Amino acid sequence: MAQRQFFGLTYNFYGQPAPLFDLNDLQELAGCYARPWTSRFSHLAISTGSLPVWSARYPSVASRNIVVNTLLGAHLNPFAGGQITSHQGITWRDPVLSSLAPVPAIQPPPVWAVAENVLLDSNNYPTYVLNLSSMWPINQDVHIMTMWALSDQGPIYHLEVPVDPMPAATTAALMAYTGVPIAHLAQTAYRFAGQLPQSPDSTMVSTIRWLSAIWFGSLTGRLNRSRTCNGFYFEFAKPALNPDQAVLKWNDGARAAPPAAAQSSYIRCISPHWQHQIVEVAGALMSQSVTAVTGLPALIDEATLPAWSQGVANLTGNGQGVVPCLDYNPVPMAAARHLQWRQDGLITAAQEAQLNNDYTAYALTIERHLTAMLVANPIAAGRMPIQPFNAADFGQAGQTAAAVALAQAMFV
Amino acid sequence: TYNITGDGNSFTPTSDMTSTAAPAIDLKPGVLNPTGKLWRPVGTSVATID
C-alpha cells in the first residue's frame, strides 16, 4: 500500500519563465479557497454538464484541472523542498499542510523555491513520510496532477479487465446504482478513497476498474445493448447534439466473450477538445484512484513523450508494461462506434449514423473555435489558465483507429 | 545630426583636450580573475555544506 517511492511529476511551462498561472490567478486560487483537497474542484465538475464550463479565470473544467496541477506544482516546492521553503503568498498553514496560508507574519526564512520542471519524491521528505496517513488523500490528488502533466495531451487514462474471478458481491451492489451517470459514481468513489486512508481491500478497487472498462467498451462500440458485459453497458443518452450522456445501463442481450485473463490499456486524447468532455475526464479520475492501491506498469514509455518528460525516475521506460499509449481524437471515434454498430447490424446507418456525425461535427467546430479564441489571451499575456496547444494539434490523427481496434481485441 | 557645412564651428585645439579614444585595454591574465566560482550543497537542502 505505502508505495514508498510515491514520486509525483509537476507540470512544465509552455516556454514560460514562470509556472502556469499569473499572480492574480494564483491569488484567486489560494486565497478565495482554503483546503488543498479536491472538494471545491469536484463541486464544479459534478454539475451534470449543465453549467457552462466557461469563466473569466476558468475557460473549461479541464482548465481548472490544469491550474489545479500548476498550483500544486508550484506550492509544493515550498514544503517539499530540501530544507523547507514557503513564502510569497503561500506559507503553509502548519507543517501538516492544512491550508493555503498568506504568509504568516514573522515567518520569512523559508524562501520561494524557484524550480524548473521537476518531479518530486513524496516519501523522501521527512515531514511528508511521517504523516503517511494524511499523505494518503493528497497522493490521490497528486496522481491526477502527474498523469495529466506527464504529457502535452488529454489525460493518460488507465484501463483494467481482470477476467474470471469476479466478485458476486460487486455485481449485487453495482446494480443498485443503475440509472446514474459515470460522473456521480466517480465522485462517491474518490470521496471514499480519500476519506479512508487507503485500503488493501480490493472491493472498491475491482469495482472502479470494471466500471472503467464497461465505459470504455461502451464508448468504442464493443459494448452496447446487445453486446454486454453480462448486462453491463453505458448508454449514450440524447442522440441529437453531441451531449450523449453515458449512463450505466443493465440490459440482458448477450454475455460478451470472456477475454484471456488480464487486459490492460491506457488511453490518451490527442485533441484539445477533451476539455469539454466530462466523460473522458471522469475515466481518467477513476484510473487515478486505482493507482493509489496498485503499482501500475511503469508509465507510458517515452516514445510518445516530450523531451522534458523523458528519463523520469522509475516512470517512463522502454521494455515494460504498455510500451505505447493508445491515442485518439474524440470525433473520429464516434464514427468508429457507429461503424461497429452498423457492422453488427444493430442499426441502419441511414439516419442514425448520419445525424450524430453531423452533430459532432458541429460540436467540434464550436469547441475548436472557443479553445483557440480563449488560448489567444494566454498566448499574449503572462497568464495561463489553459492547456497549451497549436492549431495543428486538432488533427484527425494520433492513432485514433488503432486505439479502437486494440480496445476491441482486448474484449476478445 | 547637423549639417557639417555650416557656420559657428570652433577650431580650438587645447592641451586640456588632447585627442584620446580607447586604443587598447588591459587584458592581463592575472587581471581576468575576480574571482570565486559559484557552487551548491550537492543539490539537496541546507545540510550538505560539506
Side-chain angles (χ1 to χ4, degrees), chain A residues 51-412:
Chain A
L51 194 57
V53 303
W54 296 302
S55 72
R57 209 56 264 180
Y58 304 156
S60 65
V61 174
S63 292
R64 204 176 153 210
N65 200 115
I66 297 155
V67 290
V68 164
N69 154 42
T70 59
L71 188 86
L72 296 171
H75 70 44
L76 299 183
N77 286 273
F79 261 64
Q83 42 61 259
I84 299 155
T85 78
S86 207
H87 69 199
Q88 164 279 140
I90 304 304
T91 308
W92 288 112
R93 200 174 318 160
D94 205 296
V96 295
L97 302 146
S98 81
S99 189
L100 296 150
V103 298
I106 49 159
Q107 277 58 65
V111 300
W112 198 59
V114 293
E116 274 170 91
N117 46 274
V118 65
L119 178 284
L120 301 151
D121 187 85
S122 33
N123 301 53
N124 282 156
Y125 314 124
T127 42
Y128 281 46
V129 74
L130 284 149
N131 62 234
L132 199 111
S133 54
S134 315
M135 199 191 98
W136 240 152
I138 187 96
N139 243 83
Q140 302 168 51
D141 287 320
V142 167
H143 320 160
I144 312 160
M145 169 184 83
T146 317
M147 297 198 169
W148 188 60
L150 182 73
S151 188
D152 45 280
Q153 282 64 13
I156 304 92
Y157 176 190
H158 169 81
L159 285 305
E160 206 64 70
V161 231
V163 189
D164 316 273
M166 194 282 164
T170 287
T171 320
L174 200 47
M175 226 97 57
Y177 257 176
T178 315
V180 310
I182 30 81
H184 170 53
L185 53 145
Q187 294 70 40
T188 61
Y190 94 80
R191 270 161 198 217
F192 297 131
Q195 278 155 228
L196 173 75
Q198 73 256 51
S199 176
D201 184 15
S202 54
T203 66
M204 197 176 53
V205 178
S206 60
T207 315
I208 298 144
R209 294 178 314 201
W210 319 134
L211 292 154
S212 181
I214 305 149
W215 184 61
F216 162 94
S218 256
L219 183 77
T220 47
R222 204 69 190 198
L223 306 153
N224 62 71
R225 93 303 165 124
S226 287
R227 307 174 80 207
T228 77
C229 196
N230 306 283
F232 291 127
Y233 72 91
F234 281 95
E235 197 216 291
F236 298 80
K238 216 266 289 77
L241 197 61
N242 141 271
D244 286 75
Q245 306 304 343
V247 172
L248 179 81
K249 263 285 146 316
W250 184 265
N251 307 142
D252 276 103
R255 282 77 286 111
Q263 290 305 329
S264 180
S265 61
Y266 294 83
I267 41 161
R268 56 196 227 171
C269 192
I270 41 87
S271 188
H273 307 313
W274 72 257
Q275 298 169 66
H276 299 5
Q277 294 309 308
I278 63 169
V279 268
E280 292 194 37
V281 183
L285 180 76
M286 293 192 165
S287 59
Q288 303 313 302
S289 79
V290 181
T291 326
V293 186
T294 187
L296 303 179
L299 269 52
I300 312 307
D301 291 342
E302 52 216 284
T304 55
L305 285 183
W308 71 281
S309 185
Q310 296 193 302
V312 215
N314 298 141
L315 282 166
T316 70
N318 42 37
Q320 63 218 67
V322 190
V323 181
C325 201
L326 289 73
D327 266 65
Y328 72 107
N329 183 316
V331 169
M333 190 183 256
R337 165 201 308 151
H338 277 70
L339 185 53
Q340 193 199 316
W341 288 18
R342 226 305 161 89
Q343 303 167 271
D344 301 317
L346 295 174
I347 190 60
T348 52
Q351 35 49 277
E352 197 59 77
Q354 274 59 261
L355 257 70
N356 196 272
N357 309 313
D358 305 331
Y359 291 122
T360 51
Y362 311 138
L364 173 130
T365 310
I366 46 119
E367 305 171 299
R368 195 187 174 193
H369 87 48
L370 303 153
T371 53
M373 172 285 162
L374 259 316
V375 87
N377 332 248
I379 316 307
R383 67 161 197 145
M384 210 175 275
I386 196 166
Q387 183 200 8
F389 70 92
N390 61 100
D393 295 297
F394 292 111
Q396 277 66 51
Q399 187 247 73
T400 315
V404 195
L406 296 152
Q408 300 168 293
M410 307 185 183
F411 273 91
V412 180

Side-chain angles (χ1 to χ4, degrees), chain A residues 81-84, chain B residues 44-47:
Chain A
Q83 42 61 259
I84 299 155
Chain B
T44 58
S45 46
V46 183

Side-chain angles (χ1 to χ4, degrees), chain B residues 14 34 49:
Chain B
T14 54
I49 317 150

